[PDB]
Design a protein around this ligand. Sequence first.
Ligand SMILES: Nc1ncnc2c1ncn2[C@@H]1O[C@H](COP(=O)(O)OP(=O)(O)O)[C@@H](O)[C@H]1O
Length: 239
Amino acid sequence: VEKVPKYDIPTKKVDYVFIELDKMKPHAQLVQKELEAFIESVTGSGIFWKPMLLAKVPGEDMYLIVDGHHRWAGLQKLGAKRAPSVILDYFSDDVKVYTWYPAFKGDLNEVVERLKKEGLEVIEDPEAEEKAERGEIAFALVGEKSFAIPGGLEEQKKVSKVLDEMSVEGKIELIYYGLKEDAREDMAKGIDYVFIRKAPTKEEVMELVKRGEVYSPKTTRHVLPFNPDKIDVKLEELF
Ligand SMILES: Nc1ncnc2c1ncn2[C@@H]1O[C@H](COP(=O)(O)OP(=O)(O)O)[C@@H](O)[C@H]1O
């Protein structure tokens, strides 16, 4: 579930280009539920109406998937070969990369035991949010108390893996907030805990994919200068 801060992003009529799926590099782990929903949707209508958003990888004949992991992964699993895509000026100042702030209403202790059991630490720390925003720890866990979860990407992934299982189990009301202050505004209405990491930079996203590595789901949150207008492409054109 997603809460976004009413971003008036303009639709623009930008033409698409067909790009081969094997030229596209993911930056996030897939979510099988989203992959599955896309497969049902595209095979149902037979129309692919929403182009990929790509960025050229410097120094490679490859493209970063900015938006479209489950379209990409879904087309591949169907045996398709290309997707209509819009190529972004990614390093333009007009493109911004934020993160998501996974927040939860629910009980802290079940989450701690599940986090601790995967090898993560949860040390109580009133500078945890400050450390996390500087990128010094993996996550700050902020509710009634503040806790630091140390480490880097490996630890962040473990945290995401645990949260998604407990969202699957129904032990928390997992909402990914676009902005953490909206998680704190809703927190004051009386959310329980909010996870905060430093946002990825564009440069880090590109580095990670050149390494053949990926983030957890809901790590990047791109704010773009436009949404492409809808397109008229038949599924059969993609094979
Ligand atoms: N028939 C379709 N053609 C093209 N896109 C579709 C179709 N049905 C659903 N979608 C889109 O596929 C997307 C699935 O998520 P996607 O953007 O690929 O992953 P992520 O945003 O995590 O990179 C959704 O935006 C959804 O609206």
